[PDB]
Design a protein around this ligand. Structure first.
Ligand code: 8WZ
Length: 154
């Protein structure tokens, strides 16, 4: 009962790019860039497309860094989120009516205004670790339970 999604973090040695979504799912939080994977598209090509569509950047190499399954209690469909990072981009982030991108220094990551799971796995991403996670939410603000482990391959 799972649907594929991508999430891409643009992570340079001293800063990370995040976007504030204006509407829809996740509005009002900072997050990486991503969305649903399409019919006939690989997960990685989906990740590249969503980065490009939502941020305006052009990405060359993407690196798999994690997989997180999200459950919302009562909702049948699980979100199977494939997480990628890149430090090899072209262009400048573009603010649109849907998305406002902003660079953050690594010691000023805005965890209080991000999805609450990010506090758990972002520190792993920043230390170049790979991970498998599962988070069970009740509504959008409450983590009921979770698992998170480091892995050598995603
Ligand atoms: C429930 C949930 C979903 C997503 C998501 C959907 C599509 C891409 O990511 C999240 O992203 C983060 N950082 N927490 C998240 C929680």
């Amino acid at each position: 009962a799972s649907r594929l999604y991508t999430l891409v973090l643009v992570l340079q040695p001293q800063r990370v790019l995040l976007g504030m979504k204006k509407r829809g799912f996740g509005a009002g939080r900072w997050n990486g860039f991503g969305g649903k994977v399409q019919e006939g598209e690989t997960i990685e090509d989906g990740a590249r497309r969503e980065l490009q569509e939502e941020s305006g950047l052009t990405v060359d190499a993407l690196h798999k860094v994690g997989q997180i399954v999200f459950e919302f209690v009562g909702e049948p469909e699980l979100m199977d989120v494939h997480v990628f990072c890149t430090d090899s981009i072209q262009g400048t982030p573009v603010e649109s009516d849907e998305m406002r991108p902003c660079w953050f220094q690594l010691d000023q990551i805005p965890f209080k205004d991000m999805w609450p799971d990010d506090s758990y796995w972002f520190p792993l991403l920043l230390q170049k670790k790979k991970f498998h996670g599962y988070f069970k939410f009740q509504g959008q603000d409450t983590i009921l339970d979770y698992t998170l482990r480091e892995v050598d391959t995603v």
